[PDB]
Enzyme design. Structure first.
Site, mmCIF file in Angstrom:
data_model
loop_
_atom_site.group_PDB
_atom_site.id
_atom_site.type_symbol
_atom_site.label_atom_id
_atom_site.label_comp_id
_atom_site.label_asym_id
_atom_site.label_seq_id
_atom_site.Cartn_x
_atom_site.Cartn_y
_atom_site.Cartn_z
ATOM 1 N N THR A 1 32.933 -10.796 3.494
ATOM 2 C CA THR A 1 31.980 -10.170 2.590
ATOM 3 C C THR A 1 31.752 -8.698 2.903
ATOM 4 O O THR A 1 31.303 -7.955 2.023
ATOM 5 C CB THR A 1 30.641 -10.909 2.638
ATOM 6 O OG1 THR A 1 30.129 -10.896 3.976
ATOM 7 C CG2 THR A 1 30.813 -12.345 2.177
ATOM 8 N N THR A 2 32.053 -8.259 4.126
ATOM 9 C CA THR A 2 31.859 -6.855 4.473
ATOM 10 C C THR A 2 32.895 -5.976 3.785
ATOM 11 O O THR A 2 32.561 -4.920 3.237
ATOM 12 C CB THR A 2 31.923 -6.676 5.990
ATOM 13 O OG1 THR A 2 30.881 -7.438 6.609
ATOM 14 C CG2 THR A 2 31.764 -5.209 6.361
ATOM 15 N N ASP B 1 27.650 -9.891 10.088
ATOM 16 C CA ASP B 1 28.035 -10.507 8.824
ATOM 17 C C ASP B 1 27.267 -9.870 7.674
ATOM 18 O O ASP B 1 26.032 -9.870 7.660
ATOM 19 C CB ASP B 1 27.776 -12.014 8.866
ATOM 20 C CG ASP B 1 28.751 -12.808 8.006
ATOM 21 O OD1 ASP B 1 29.465 -12.205 7.175
ATOM 22 O OD2 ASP B 1 28.801 -14.045 8.163
ATOM 23 N N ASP C 1 29.982 -19.744 10.508
ATOM 24 C CA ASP C 1 31.006 -18.828 10.021
ATOM 25 C C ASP C 1 32.357 -19.052 10.686
ATOM 26 O O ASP C 1 33.383 -18.662 10.119
ATOM 27 C CB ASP C 1 30.564 -17.381 10.241
ATOM 28 C CG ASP C 1 29.330 -17.019 9.435
ATOM 29 O OD1 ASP C 1 29.130 -17.603 8.350
ATOM 30 O OD2 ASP C 1 28.557 -16.150 9.891
HETATM 31 N N1 LIG Z 1 40.482 -6.575 16.261
HETATM 32 C C1 LIG Z 1 40.927 -6.432 14.983
HETATM 33 N N2 LIG Z 1 41.931 -5.521 14.661
HETATM 34 C C2 LIG Z 1 42.383 -5.461 13.363
HETATM 35 N N3 LIG Z 1 41.810 -6.130 12.343
HETATM 36 C C3 LIG Z 1 40.795 -7.003 12.526
HETATM 37 C C4 LIG Z 1 40.283 -7.211 13.888
HETATM 38 N N4 LIG Z 1 39.284 -8.105 13.773
HETATM 39 C C5 LIG Z 1 39.168 -8.456 12.466
HETATM 40 N N5 LIG Z 1 40.082 -7.800 11.724
HETATM 41 C C6 LIG Z 1 40.245 -7.910 10.250
HETATM 42 O O1 LIG Z 1 38.976 -7.647 9.647
HETATM 43 C C7 LIG Z 1 38.753 -8.498 8.523
HETATM 44 C C8 LIG Z 1 37.307 -8.991 8.506
HETATM 45 O O2 LIG Z 1 37.065 -9.851 9.618
HETATM 46 P P1 LIG Z 1 35.642 -10.575 9.839
HETATM 47 O O3 LIG Z 1 34.749 -9.693 10.676
HETATM 48 O O4 LIG Z 1 35.916 -11.992 10.284
HETATM 49 O O5 LIG Z 1 35.001 -10.635 8.363
HETATM 50 P P2 LIG Z 1 33.738 -9.711 7.985
HETATM 51 O O6 LIG Z 1 34.144 -8.324 8.415
HETATM 52 O O7 LIG Z 1 33.590 -9.882 6.493
HETATM 53 O O8 LIG Z 1 32.609 -10.304 8.791
HETATM 54 C C9 LIG Z 1 39.773 -9.626 8.604
HETATM 55 O O9 LIG Z 1 40.489 -9.712 7.371
HETATM 56 C C10 LIG Z 1 40.699 -9.277 9.759
HETATM 57 O O10 LIG Z 1 42.060 -9.231 9.320
#
Ligand SMILES: Nc1ncnc2c1ncn2[C@@H]1O[C@H](COP(=O)(O)OP(=O)(O)O)[C@@H](O)[C@H]1O
Ligand SMILES: Nc1ncnc2c1ncn2[C@@H]1O[C@H](COP(=O)(O)OP(=O)(O)O)[C@@H](O)[C@H]1O
Ligand SMILES: Nc1ncnc2c1ncn2[C@@H]1O[C@H](COP(=O)(O)OP(=O)(O)O)[C@@H](O)[C@H]1O
Lengths: 510, 481, 509
Positions: free
Chosen positions: C76-77, C43, C377
């Site tokens: 947020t990433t 995160d 989260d």
């Molecule tokens: N296995 C996956 N394949 C494609 N897209 C993904 C996958 N996992 C997450 N995502 C996409 O990555 C974005 C960020 O997910 P998440 O990790 O929950 O938030 P952050 O990267 O900010 O921690 C989301 O909008 C989601 O659509």
């Protein structure tokens, strides 16, 4: 990857150099020869073929204009700017981890879509006097001070029409270039015939002859050596001069037949005769021919004698023993104009000399050589307009209409090839961006203006160098050759392919 | 071991240069000359030829490649890569503390298995069918200027080696240097080129009194006291009434005075190889001197004698309607650059026909031949009793670099396709499921013309393993003479 | 212009750092505290809020993700990834001579156009068990090691569904998150009741009580001060013991008062009694109440007493002299759970607690903190899914469809701002470029297939991480919240507007 970044940053610097000297609003560049000569010019081919560049990579790009000048002779400035922007845009995709070879196939697909779009923009209209005036004004403007535009426009166009008729293939050898000092720059004009360097040296020669016959010869009428098996049999220095007359006896008798040829061939008043012997003539031989009013010339160049056969028709004779009136030429008002430094002969008023001479006038050598570059650059653009009846609108009208087509183009070869098409489209748009800076207007205002113009018919707009508005290049009189734009799509992509295909750089003895 | 490891980095760096110079998408290289110039070639043969190297182990890689250029004009890029990749496995030389002799026996043992594995995926060829040979030779015509006249290059390349081959002796020897002398003639275009069915001498015409055109020529192969022998050595030749006097050494100025009196062609500076082709063409015989001539030294059976000035240059055509274990190519072109393109590109195609005619066997190229081999040695290592099985498996993992470069040069995911490329050879037959060099994806080689000869790969793996054996047999550098 | 180049390249380096922890298939980052604490997480809020960065320009971007995590709770990433790419593409035009003011006008137009594009592609699917599992899969998959997905997915979904009825809004304080050690990581499940740290410790206590009336107290049952007008005055150690007889009359007599209430309210068999006094208790009071089937608990938290009022229903008492039956509660199974070392009280099966307990289990400390944040989260991701009835497809499917709307869009305000929209188009496409690399596939080949997917219908196309082909995020159960992307495009444009307009950097102390 860092080794490829050198050739990218190497040509990026060459892009920043040759971007300010494009168009009439652009700047000039100086050539410091070190020996005492200074040259001013805008044509990029002159800034690279004679110049030596610091970086080794950019030196390879200098040879592109060398091979490009042999095909078209113009557009070398815009060729490096497309190459500089292509590898600039491609660096943004390679930085993300894409291979260069995938981007090159994208340009190979954009070449066909861009080349196929060129068939639509070109106009097959009939080339006439009013059409070429629009062409000469587009090229010569970038080589003069905005004052010799109308002066040299009428000279280059008439030089071409007077040496090509009945769909005859034209050649640049037919137009001779001459330069003269002690005059102003706006006094450039044309010559019906050929201007000779060395004239006659005797007060008894006719200053101007309304009509005179020409006789081509290569026989030296000076004190020559012996022709028969004999020698110098003498006993003192006074006898030496007696046999000098013998070696001149074979020469003196040959000049007496020239007067006989003049007396037999129109030996009546209101006539004339002009000898064009390339070899020297003795002051005594000129004294004999000057009494009859024969304006004999000597010490000419081998190139003029070949052109004299075409303009005058007199066949070259190698010996006066075979003197016949069949090898006699003809000329109109033959005169020698008196200038501030030297005198030069004119053979103007020919029926069809098949050769003209563009007499350039300028006070300085750097100004005289600059116009010489404008002539050969302006002549070839008209040569490419007649030999290739197809021409296209300038002002970046071809590049913008092509760039709009590449964005609305689906991948017809490969999937990832579309990325190179996205980069090749952003490269051609640098031409309206370059001219926006040389004009002093906003670089972005010029782009969206010409791009916002859309309609349900043919609409090719361009850059207004004076105002910056989106102006039609076809109506205002801006036209470019079909072969010029054709080489840009082949040269910029083939060269940009060779730079992106370099993986590593190894020193082979350096 | 410092000397054992020195030959690794000495060759690993050389292989790094031409690692991306493989395939039809071969990457170019920038060589900085000392005078600031740059050469932008891409052929690995000429790149390493000019690059001066400091280590002796790397200098042997250049001497090995030049000998490969004489046998086969292509494939030498992979010769150094395999020899460089085979030696790049330092885990088995130093970290495992094995002797070099342990690994040399392992590679020599693997050599005999690779040879048998490539013959299992072989395929016969019907050389009688010119269309089946067109698919093989087109591998070199593609991406060239000769693609516009591919059918002409096929007729020139395929029929020329048929004239050199002599199948009555059993060995069926083919020599390009002696029996396939390629020469150029100015004038014309690439379309005007043809293969002369005989001998052509490049001797210019010095005197005007010479037989210009004769349909039935006659070839003879071979102050006071000075002109004594000169008139007699020349008078013994006209006893047969020849039309062209072919001498081995140079002819004097006074001896030519009788050759121009006879109004016969005077040829000199002819090799011993060149006269034998003529003796076999028109049935003449090579005599030691002019004074001991006989009746057999005649030109009965010759086609014609023509010294016509073609393209502002004389050329002595003494061709015939026979193939006397020799041939002669007539390359025509408007300029030297175009002539230089066809002359060198046909030598790449002419050497491919040499490999097929000696042994009509092909192999599936484009990364298909390597995976077919590497899959055979991997399963054999699980049942090979001995410590040599570990370096035996390194050859199975090292030969995968050839398809790795073809996919990496294309830019596609080499890790995703190469791992799946193993499954195609694991389940389905190994003779198919190759790699497309232009596209990058997998495709079968039976449908494409990526088939290479057998002699090209045999000399590759023999010299690729022999190079690693010669480099690992070194353990110290001796300085002195 | 040089004041921007220091800020431009500062974000480009920050882009290459945090791009390798987007999605589940990406890598993790380590946090070296220097004191002995080590932490792992993906995160970006923790990689920026608790981490110390060298550059001051990048320190301002850290505060953006801090507030972004407070609103939406995720994404947020990619917020910093778009910011780093917005200034990357802006630098391409700044080199040509464009002022940053016009580029901000282009982002303002594309931001309002893209916000209108979310209103078209958003899906207002009914909220239920099957749909929220698809959403919670998206939030928790990127916070674990590809094994706790199905384990923790059922937890967060049923946790929020237990505390949502009568159209009541969601509150995060209705969930008591506890942690337990000496166990494995896959044992994380849900606890209906409330878990107490300390419980009854006496041999005479019952191991479990099927039904007990929980009495809430706050009375001190240890050695306290004198409650009458007196004090502690003695002359020796033996005289001091006589004062213990006097002071303990305030503690001992209060133990019998609980026994009198026990026999009063359900003193028969098949019943029970549980005292949840917050103060400490003397062992004599434990032995006295343990024999009577009365379980006496002590050493509870201040917040646990608040939830205990809701579990049983007994009102908090402050003195046993004010004891009454009205403050008595009721609960179901009340027992004690046993771990490897410690033991905890469990009062599950309550009447109407309105407060659930997500009991976390893990063997290590640094691994328990990783799941600690994934719970907060994961709970907030589904919280916005129910409060916001509309959702959007995940898998980066919004970015590839957004690029089609903005390229096919002309500004109706001016021309030169059109290039700012072109930069905002390539800035949003970095997410499918990042995830293509974290998955190990080619960056551009994955972007072509998802962009080339077109049809004569409404087609939602996303990124497949397992194969690399176009994935319809609605068919695989890949969804996000509607407020996430809305806050993404609303936030990322304001920061790019504030930084690009910096003309000069002066050293102010
Ligand atoms: N296995 C996956 N394949 C494609 N897209 C993904 C996958 N996992 C997450 N995502 C996409 O990555 C974005 C960020 O997910 P998440 O990790 O929950 O938030 P952050 O990267 O900010 O921690 C989301 O909008 C989601 O659509
Ligand atoms: N004022 C202008 N209007 C339209 N086009 C122009 C103008 N000035 C320059 N150009 C374009 O620039 C191009 C190159 O001109 P020039 O520099 O003279 O030749 P080269 O670039 O080959 O040296 C021409 O094709 C012309 O169309
Ligand atoms: N059309 C093609 N498709 C796939 N692979 C090819 C193709 N053409 C050549 N190759 C591969 O490129 C390698 C090198 O070929 P070549 O250029 O003839 O030799 P070298 O690289 O040594 O000059 C061969 O091993 C072959 O497998």
């Amino acid at each position: 990857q860092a080794a490829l970044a050198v050739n990218i940053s190497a040509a990026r610097g060459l892009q920043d150099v040759l971007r300010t000297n494009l168009g009439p609003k652009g700047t000039m560049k100086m050539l410091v020869s070190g020996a005492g000569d200074i040259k001013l010019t805008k044509d990029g081919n002159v800034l690279l073929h004679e110049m030596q560049i610091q970086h080794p990579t950019a030196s390879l790009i200098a040879k592109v204009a060398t091979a490009q000048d042999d095909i078209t002779g113009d557009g070398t400035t815009s060729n490096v700017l497309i190459i500089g922007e292509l590898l600039k845009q491609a660096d943004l995709y390679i930085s993300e981890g894409l291979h260069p070879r995938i981007i090159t196939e994208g340009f190979e697909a954009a070449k066909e879509k861009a080349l196929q779009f060129l068939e639509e923009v070109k106009v097959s209209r009939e080339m006439d006097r009013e059409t070429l005036i629009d062409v000469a004004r587009t090229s010569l403007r970038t080589k003069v001070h905005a004052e010799l535009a109308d002066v040299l426009t009428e000279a280059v166009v008439d030089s071409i029409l007077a040496i090509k008729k009945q769909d005859e293939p034209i050649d640049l050898f037919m137009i001779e270039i001459m330069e003269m000092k002690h005059k102003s720059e706006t006094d450039t004009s044309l010559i019906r015939g050929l201007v000779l360097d060395h004239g006659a040296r005797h007060p008894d020669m006719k200053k101007r002859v309304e009509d005179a016959y020409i006789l081509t010869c290569n026989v030296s009428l000076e004190y020559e050596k012996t022709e028969v098996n004999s020698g110098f049999f003498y006993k003192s220095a006074e006898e030496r001069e007696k046999l000098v007359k013998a070696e001149r006896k074979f020469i003196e008798d040959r000049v007496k037949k020239i007067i006989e040829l003049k007396r037999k061939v129109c030996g009546d008043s209101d006539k004339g005769f002009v000898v064009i012997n390339q070899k020297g003539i003795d002051p005594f031989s000129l004294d004999a021919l000057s009494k009859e009013g024969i304006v004999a010339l000597r010490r000419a160049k081998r190139r003029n004698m070949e052109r004299l056969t075409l303009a005058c028709g007199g066949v070259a004779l190698n010996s006066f023993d075979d003197l016949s009136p069949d090898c006699l030429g003809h000329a109109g008002l033959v005169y020698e104009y008196t200038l501030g430094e030297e005198k030069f002969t004119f053979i103007e008023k020919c029926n069809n000399p098949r050769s003209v001479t563009l007499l350039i006038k300028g006070p300085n050598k750097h100004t005289l050589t600059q116009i010489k570059d404008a002539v050969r650059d302006g002549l070839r653009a008209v040569k490419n307009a007649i030999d290739d009846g197809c021409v296209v609108p300038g002002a970046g009208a071809v590049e913008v209409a092509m760039a709009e087509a590449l964005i609305k183009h689906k991948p017809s070869v490969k999937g990832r090839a579309q990325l190179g098409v996205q980069a090749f489209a952003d490269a051609l748009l640098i031409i309206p961006k370059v001219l926006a800076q040389n004009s002093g207007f906003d670089l972005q205002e010029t782009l969206v203006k010409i791009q916002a113009e859309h309609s349900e018919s043919g609409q090719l707009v361009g850059v207004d160098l004076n105002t910056g508005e989106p102006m039609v290049a076809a109506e205002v009189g801006v036209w470019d050759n079909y072969c010029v734009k054709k080489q840009l799509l082949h040269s910029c992509t083939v060269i940009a392919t060779n730079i992106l295909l370099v993986d590593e750089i190894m020193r082979a003895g350096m | 071991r410092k000397v054992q490891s020195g030959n690794i980095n000495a060759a690993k760096t050389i292989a790094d240069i031409i690692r991306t110079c493989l395939g039809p998408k071969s990457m170019m290289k920038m060589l900085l000359d000392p005078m600031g110039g740059i050469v932008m070639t891409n052929d690995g043969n000429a790149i390493l030829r000019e690059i001066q190297v400091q280590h002796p182990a790397a200098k042997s890689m250049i001497e090995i490649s030049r000998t490969q250029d004489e046998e086969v004009g292509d494939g030498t890029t992979s010769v150094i890569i395999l020899a460089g990749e085979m030696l790049s496995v330092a885990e088995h030389f130093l970290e495992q503390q094995m002797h070099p002799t342990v690994v040399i026996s392992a590679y020599r043992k693997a050599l005999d298995d690779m040879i048998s594995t490539l013959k299992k995926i072989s395929i016969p060829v019907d050389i009688s069918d010119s269309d089946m040979m067109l698919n093989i030779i087109n591998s070199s015509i593609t991406t060239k200027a000769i693609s516009r006249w591919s059918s002409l290059a096929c007729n020139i390349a395929l029929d020329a080696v048929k004239m050199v081959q002599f199948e009555e002796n059993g060995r069926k020897e083919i020599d390009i240097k002696k029996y396939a002398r390629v020469e150029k003639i100015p004038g014309g275009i690439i379309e005007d080129s043809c293969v002369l069915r005989g001998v052509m001498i490049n001797k210019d015409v010095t005197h005007p009194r010479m037989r210009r055109y004769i349909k039935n020529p006659r070839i003879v192969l071979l102050l006071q006291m000075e002109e004594e022998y000169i008139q007699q050595l020349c008078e013994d030749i006209i006893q047969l009434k020849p039309d062209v006097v072919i001498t081995e050494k140079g002819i004097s100025d006074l001896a030519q005075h009788y050759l121009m009196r006879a109004n016969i062609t005077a040829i000199r500076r002819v090799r011993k190889t060149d006269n034998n082709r003529i003796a076999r063409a028109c049935g003449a015989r090579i005599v030691s001197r002019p004074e001991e001539l006989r009746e057999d030294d005649v030109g009965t059976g010759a086609g014609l004698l023509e010294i016509k000035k073609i393209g502002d240059e004389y050329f002595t055509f003494i061709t015939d309607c026979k193939d006397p274990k020799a041939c002669t190519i007539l390359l025509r072109g408007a300029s030297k650059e175009i002539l230089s393109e066809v002359e060198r590109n046909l030598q790449d195609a002419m050497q491919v026909c040499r490999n097929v005619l000696l042994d009509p066997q092909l192999v599936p190229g484009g990364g298909a031949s390597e995976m077919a081999v590497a899959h055979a040695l991997t399963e054999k290592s699980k049942a090979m009793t001995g410590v040599e099985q570990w370096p035996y498996r390194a050859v199975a993992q090292a030969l995968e670099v050839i398809p790795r470069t073809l996919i990496q040069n294309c830019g596609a995911s080499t890790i995703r396709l190469l791992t799946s490329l193993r499954a195609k050879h694991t389940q389905e037959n190994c003779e198919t499921w190759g790699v497309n060099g232009e596209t990058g994806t997998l495709v079968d080689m039976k449908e494409l013309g990526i088939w290479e000869p057998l002699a090209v790969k045999l000399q590759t793996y023999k010299t690729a393993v022999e190079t690693a054996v010669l480099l690992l047999r070194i353990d110290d550098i001796v300085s002195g003479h």
